[PDB]
Amino acid sequence: SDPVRQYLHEIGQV
């Protein structure tokens, strides 16, 4: 839904 949070997760994967 929220692009910011989603990107934070995707970045939090590394």
Partner 1 sequence: MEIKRFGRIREVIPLPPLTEIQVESYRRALQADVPPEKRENVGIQAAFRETFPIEEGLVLDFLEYRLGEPPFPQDECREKDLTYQAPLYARLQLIHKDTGLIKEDEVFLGHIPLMTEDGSFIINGADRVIVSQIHRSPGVYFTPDPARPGRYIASIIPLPKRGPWIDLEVEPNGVVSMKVNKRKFPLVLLLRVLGYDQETLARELGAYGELVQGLMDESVFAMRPEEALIRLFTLLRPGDPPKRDKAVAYVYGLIADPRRYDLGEAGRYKAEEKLGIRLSGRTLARFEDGEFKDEVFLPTLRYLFALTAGVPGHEVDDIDHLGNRRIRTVGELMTDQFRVGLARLARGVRERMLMGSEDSLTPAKLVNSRPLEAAIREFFSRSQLSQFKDETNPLSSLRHKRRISALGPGGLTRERAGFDVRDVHRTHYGRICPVETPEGANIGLITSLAAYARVDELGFIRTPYRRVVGGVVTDEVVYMTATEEDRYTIAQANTPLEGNRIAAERVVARRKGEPVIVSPEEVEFMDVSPKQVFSVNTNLIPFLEHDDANRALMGSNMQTQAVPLIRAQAPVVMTGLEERVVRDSLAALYAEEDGEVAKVDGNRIVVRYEDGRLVEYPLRRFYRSNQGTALDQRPRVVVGQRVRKGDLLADGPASENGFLALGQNVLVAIMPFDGYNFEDAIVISEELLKRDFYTSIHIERYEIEARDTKLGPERITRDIPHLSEAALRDLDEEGVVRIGAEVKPGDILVGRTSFKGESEPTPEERLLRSIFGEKARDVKDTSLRVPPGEGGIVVRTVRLRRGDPGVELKPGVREVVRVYVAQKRKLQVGDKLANRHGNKGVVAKILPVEDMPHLPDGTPVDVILNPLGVPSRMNLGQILETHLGLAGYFLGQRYISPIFDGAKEPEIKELLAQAFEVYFGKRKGEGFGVDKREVEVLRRAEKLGLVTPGKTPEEQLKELFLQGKVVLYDGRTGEPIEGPIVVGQMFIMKLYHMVEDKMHARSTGPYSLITQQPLGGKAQFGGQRFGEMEVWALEAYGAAHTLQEMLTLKSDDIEGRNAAYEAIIKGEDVPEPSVPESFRVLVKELQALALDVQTLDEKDNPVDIFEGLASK
Partner DNA sequence: GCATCCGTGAGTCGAGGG
Partner DNA sequence: TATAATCCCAGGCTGTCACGGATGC
Is 14 a binding residue for partner 1 by CB under 8 A? The answer is no
- Measure Cα distances from 14 to 6, 8 in Å: 14, 11
Is 1 a binding residue for DNA by CB under 7 A? The answer is no
Count of residues in contact with partner 1, rule CB under 8 A = 3
Residue 11 binding result from partner 1, DNA, none, given CB thresholds of 5 to 8 Å by partner type: DNA
d(CA 5, CA 9): 6
Q: Read out DSSP for 1-14?
A: --HHHHHHHHHHT-
Q: Cβ of residue 5: shortest distance to partner 1, in angstroms? A: 5
| Residues found near DNA in the complex (CB under 7 A) | 2, 4-5, 8-9, 11-12
